[PDB]
Amino acid sequence: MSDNEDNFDGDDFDDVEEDEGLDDLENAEEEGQENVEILPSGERPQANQKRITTPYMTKYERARVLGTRALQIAMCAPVMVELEGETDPLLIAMKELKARKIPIIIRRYLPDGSYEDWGVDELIITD
Template sequence: MSSPEEPQLATPETEISEGEVDANLGLNKALDTYRKLIEKKDGKEPLSEKDQANLEDKIKEIEEREVVEKIDDHDPVEIPCEKGKITIGPPTLTRFEQARIMGARALQLSLGAPPFITIPKNARISLDISMEELEQKVIPITIRRVLPNGDYQNIPIDYFA
C-alpha cells in the first residue's frame, strides 16, 4: 500500500516584518487617497506634466519623513496662566467642563455642603443652585486642560469669559 502524496503549497518567503507591512500599508493607503484628492481637485482635466511631477515630489517627500510614534523623554510641564490668558483650548468653558462642574457641585450640595450664594426662589433641586453658582463664578474650582504631550494648564474659573 502506497500513500498518495499530498501536494504542498509553495509559500513565498518574505523578510519584511509584520510591523513594517502594517506601517507601509497605512502609508500607501494615505498616499493613494492624497493622490486621488489632488487629481480630482482640478475636475475633468487631467493633471499637466508639471503638476504630476509636483505631486510625485510631494509624495516622495511624505514617504521620506521620519515617523515619530512616541517621545519618552518629555516630562509634563505646567503652562502658567499669565494675566488671565488661556493658552490651551477655547476661552470659554466647554459644555463638557460645565456639565462636570455642575454635576460635582450639585452632588456636594445634595450631600449637605453649604451653598456659596443665596438660594434663588425658582431653585427646586441642587442642580439649579449649582447652575446659578457657575453663572456667578463663585465656585472655587480650577480646570486642568492637558495637551497630548502631557503639558497642562490649570485655569481658575474666574478667567473664563
C-alpha cells in the same frame, strides 16, 4: 489558637503578582481629548507661565463642574449664590457656575501631554 483561618471561604485575596521593570508603551492609552482635572480651590496649584488655552468654559467643563458641585451640595455643601427658589443642587450649581461662584480649579490637558490650570473664576462660561 484561632480557627478563623479555616472559617473562611473566598478570602478577598487581592492577588499581588510582582512585575517591576515593565515597558511603558505610550500607545497604552485610549484618551486623546481635553481630559481636565476637577480640583477644589483653596490650595490653588498653578504653573508659572502664560497659558495657551482660552479663559472660556463650554458645555464640557460646565457639565463636569456642575456634576461635581451637585455632588458637593447634595452632601449638604454651603451655597455661594442667591436663592430665589433654587432648592436643588443642580439649580444652585447652575447659578454658581454661571456666576463663576463655584470654587474649583480646572486643569486642562492637551494630547501632547501638557496641562494648564484654569479656575472657574478665570473662565467665562457661555451658557
